[PDB]
Symmetry: C5
Subunit: 311 residues, 5 copies
């Protein structure tokens, strides 16, 4: 079967629509998400047109094999979509109304700069390759674009699901291609990060600073070194839930900066001890007393600077 | 093949039934479960009706290809169900009796607020899309809804398997849809959590409190800091077996609260030492003596408050 | 194609046999095992019968499509078995001899009460659903039930592979079902658990007890607390290799009990120190001296009691 | 299609050959490896024979469906091989030349006794089941057995790929079976184990022995206990990369033995301290001085004994 | 269908082209990458040639089944590529223009010697096996070789995608094979390794060196032993993200060398203490004072030597 012939030299407009049934498995490391949705296609094939009076029927239902159906593919899927045709309905004027239910693992890049307070725009790219007979152009029927109410993405808030109505028409392998951008805007549920990572990480840091109220070198070494190891554990836990970015993430920046606080705390703990042994505890006392104010102030200001830079 | 024609302007009622053969793999993080069950469908196709006297047979057996079968799909499955038709039996009045055996990975949300003492309602949503010829409505044949005795879900107690008999009829893409709710009520087997997480977590906390019966700052620092690290390990162990919730879980609340106990224990240990060095051990003794009663009392009351809030 | 017609009102007896080719991947957490075996089926279809003299051939080979084959399914498989028909041989009395090679992930529950010294009975349930024409009953041809010599299950000893010859005939959805039980008896290779978990776990415990020969509170705190953390690591390592049971496992019981030994050791270490500071080292000496005998004796007796209760 | 008829009462000899294209994913825990290779089959079917003069062609190319092809299966694959027929060429005498390209996950047991200095013999078992018409026997055409130069197995050295030319002919289910053994000899690349596990493990042990040059019980307790925990971490790291063997592995033996060294070091550290408190430091000095020589000597001799026993 | 017949004794030239649509999942441990691309094939079949005047059409579109298509396979894929034919267009002279969209998991070895500052050349090997009728030779149509702009490989920089235009023609199983090399040059995004592994690893090492400004053996033991354990954790974290190489990697070399620094620091800490107890603190002071300069200088020079050797 060949494509529908043109009235003039116009291209064939295939009206599209994606209706999300299920949404799930957003893999941060892999930068992928799984989707289960309705795909709707509609185009005019004058060859399939009929008189409702003569035929008796108001619409004709065809099996996929029987008629010409445009080869609609997804640009950013890992493997070809697992589709099952729901219905094909031809109107008297030849307006075909195709509907399929698909499932696919979509590969869409993620921006982790403000993690875990980040928001993302997941993409679904519909594409059609023009045939030698005639050029095929994609369109968005906004009435067939949407999502089910029940849809939820674990640990994410689904903001919107819209389509960029004007297609990206370009040449590839000397043939026209019509690309459509379906955008699923989501924003991370940062809540859990606060009692699981942020607050425990701050508690261990504050525990390290109790060495500014101790003259016992042995106790201080234990305090600063132990807490530093707990901070390593938190850093490792965090980097496992994320991919390797060629940029600094918000949480990444905080965690890294905290290493410098542990480093300088060790230096202070060392200096205080050296001076005490050197029989200069008056100078050591001045340094320790200052550190009690310096460490939280410099920590608080550095964090304001980071939050400012990142948001 | 087209759908059965109506007697009047009535919709076609497809009677359904799910009989669970096997149940397994409830993924808490992914909020999914795998099912292996019987699907039964029954509708009246007057076109397939026959006289038992003339034909000789009491029922006629057809191959799926031969007759019209309603396109029944599952709303919340990840990928299309892996089904194999067991039997299709037509009665003389045209009452078709379809049976298939399926397996699917069902996506049903879980409520972790009372974890690990939580109970869940897993869902299986049957759906049918109405055709242009006529509207299709789902029904529950309670005689064909059930589960095998042997069925067990690892680490869960299967309470019930029922169906919400009245379907959720709605419009989607200008077409009628009939949705049915099959509910599998389950409740978690919290036993193992007690000797593996809860009791070990309490033991390390109680060990930290022995610093209230020690004047040795160095020993106290070791006691409170070490146990705190074991508590971090338990927190990390727990959060790996669970997804990121935008709410606090029962175990999550307990674990978080325990961090504050370690923090205040460090403050006490620090205060006691500062005072001792300051040549005020009488004041330090008062604080330590109070802490011996204060720490378990405030812990016990805080837990009563939490259990009350959560249950 | 319809089933073979009966001579009298007898049911159709389908003789079965499973011959294990490969055995592997027993998942303790998932309570599943993968199998790769021969499936043999044999039934009498009088309609396929022929004259050897007239036809020339002694047996006729048919393609699965050509003749009626009973719908034999496995009850406890996750997804439908991946089968490939090896041969179908019809004798001229109409005795069909079907053989297929399959592979499946079988879901069979495991009893961890005596882990790692446990033994299991893995099951393979053959099932047939009776048709409206006539009832189908399963049988075991003991000559076609067995396993290859090479077969081995990693970390397990394969004891036997037998079939419960009398089928479980019952009604389900107003139709007769014939269920057969193929049992693969296995017993765990507990060897590795001794030098990897049991002995290292005992060594750290015995190390903690050296605090009964030390008056240094600071050293004792280090000894008991450190070893307790190593015991947490061993407990966590063990629980990862196992599913959450609503009962206590043998290793689980030992590990849990050991926590109480660490708890009481801390109490002793604390008591001894308090008394020493209180200028009562004579009483502290009595307690420490007793503990040296009490701790191993109570440990040894408690273990005898556990081993007795568990075996 | 039936098998080729025999000239006399001889069996049909199917000449085989495996040419490895790609080799990869040797899973030590699962005892499996993935293969991507050429399968070649050649047998004489006199029914397909032709005169080159009359026909014009020197060889005839057939589609798999058109002619009889022997049912060649792999014994030790997990699931049936993913094969794609490359070519089928019939010579004038009826000598069929079949070639397919396959990929399979082969299950072959591994001997970890000398790990990580072990060598293995991976197996690929070709099998054919004889038909009721005539018996089928496998043969090795050594000219069609080999491997690509590029082939490499990550972390392994590929020694050889040969076939045991004489098949294992036996009865199974009253039918003849011809089994062939394709052996892929490999030897582990033990290099990485030296700077990652062996040397770090020895360093921590030697660090523990510095307690023989210290009279500080508190420091010694820290030295021996800390290093012992690092040794636990190494033992756990090792056992994760390996399956549970009912025998001792070389690395397993070394690691286990090292636990005894830590145990005895604790005993020494304890004894030395007890004696010092008991105001007998002369006796404690003798024990400590001996331990300085005893510990490395006994360690070195024990290792010679192990290496001897294992190799 | 047989291959196109030759004009003279020339081989059939199949012009190829790969256009990368999506690139992803480069597994360092498995040494694999997933690809989603366009495959284009073009050859001359004179049998399909036609007069544009007589036929009316300028090009003819065929279904894969209808005409002869060369059996093009990938050498280094794990399993056979998942391909879907996009278009087949025949020109009047018989120049066939085939296009398919594929997805495959390509196995290409990686060189980790300069990790994480390494660069790689991923390969895609196109291969064709010559038929008995005539020899088939591959060619590169440079106009149909490329990649989409959007293409990105997570944690990698895509440098180029070119093809080695002259094929590797060789004999295999007495038949000609034409192999083509498609090279995807990539270079690692080493950024993240600096704040996550390199700098934290240096910080803990520098913390260990504060023991050169402390006379407290107990504090020094804590400093050097604790930091050494954090270094073990970093070594383990690194080796999990990498496969077992029979060579030293850059990061591997640094990490290994750092163990020697911890070992010698322990020796210094031990020596200093022994001398102090031996009432020789003047000699111990000389050693400690030297170590303060020696340790960073020898560390810095050793690193220059390593960087030099590795780059
Ligand atoms: C002379 C003393 C030898 C000690 C040998 C210890 C044997 C342990 C055997 C374990 C077998 C499994 C229970 C662990 C106790 C550790 C030993 C404490 C030593 C105290 C030294 C006091 C010096 C007078
Ligand atoms: C303490 C740590 C001790 C390490 C034991 C050394 C290994 C060994 O002794 O292992 C022996 C292996 C096995 O080589 P093979 O050819 O298979 O021996 C077969 C010989 N027969 C047939 C006679 C039995 O030799 C090697 O790979 C030697 C180089 C590795 C040295 C690593 C040292 C660090
Ligand atoms: Cl697609
Ligand atoms: Cl479905
Ligand atoms: Cl509505
Ligand atoms: Cl409607
Ligand atoms: Cl099955
Ligand atoms: Cl096979
Ligand atoms: Cl391929
Ligand atoms: Na079509
Ligand atoms: Na149908
Ligand atoms: Na059949
Ligand atoms: Na065939
Ligand atoms: Na310490
Ligand atoms: Na073809």
């Amino acid at each position: 079967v060949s494509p529908p012939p043109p009235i003039a030299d116009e291209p064939l407009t295939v009206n599209t629509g994606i209706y999300l049934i299920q949404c799930y498995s957003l893999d941060d490391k892999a930068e992928t998400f799984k989707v289960n949705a309705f795909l709707s296609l509609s185009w005019k094939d004058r060859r399939l047109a009929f008189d409702p009076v003569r035929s008796g029927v108001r619409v004709k239902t065809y099996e996929p094999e029987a008629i010409w159906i445009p080869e609609i593919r997804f640009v950013n899927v890992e493997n070809a979509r697992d589709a099952d045709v729901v219905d094909i309905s031809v109107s008297p004027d030849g307006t075909v109304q195709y509907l399929e239910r698909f499932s696919a693992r979509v590969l869409s890049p993620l921006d982790f700069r403000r993690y875990p307070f980040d928001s993302q725009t997941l993409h679904i790219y519909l594409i059609v390759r023009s045939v030698d007979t005639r050029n095929i152009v994609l369109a968005v029927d906004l009435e067939k674009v949407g999502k089910n109410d029940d849809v939820f993405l674990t640990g994410w808030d689904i903001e919107s699901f819209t389509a960029v109505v004007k297609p990206a028409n370009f040449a590839l392998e000397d043939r026209l291609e019509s690309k459509l951008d379906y955008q699923l805007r989501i924003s991370r549920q940062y809540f859990s990060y606060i009692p699981n990572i942020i607050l425990p990480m701050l508690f261990i840091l504050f525990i390290s600073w109790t060495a500014f109220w101790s003259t016992s070198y042995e106790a201080n070494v234990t305090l600063v070194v132990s807490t530093l190891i707990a901070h390593i554990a938190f850093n490792i836990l965090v980097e496992t839930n994320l991919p390797k970015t060629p940029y600094m993430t918000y949480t990444g920046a905080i965690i890294f900066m905290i290493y410098l606080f542990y480093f300088v705390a060790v230096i202070e703990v060392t200096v205080q001890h050296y001076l005490k042994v050197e029989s200069q505890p008056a100078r050591a006392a001045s340094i320790t007393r200052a550190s009690r104010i310096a460490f939280p102030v410099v920590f608080l200001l550095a964090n304001i600077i980071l939050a400012f830079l990142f948001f």
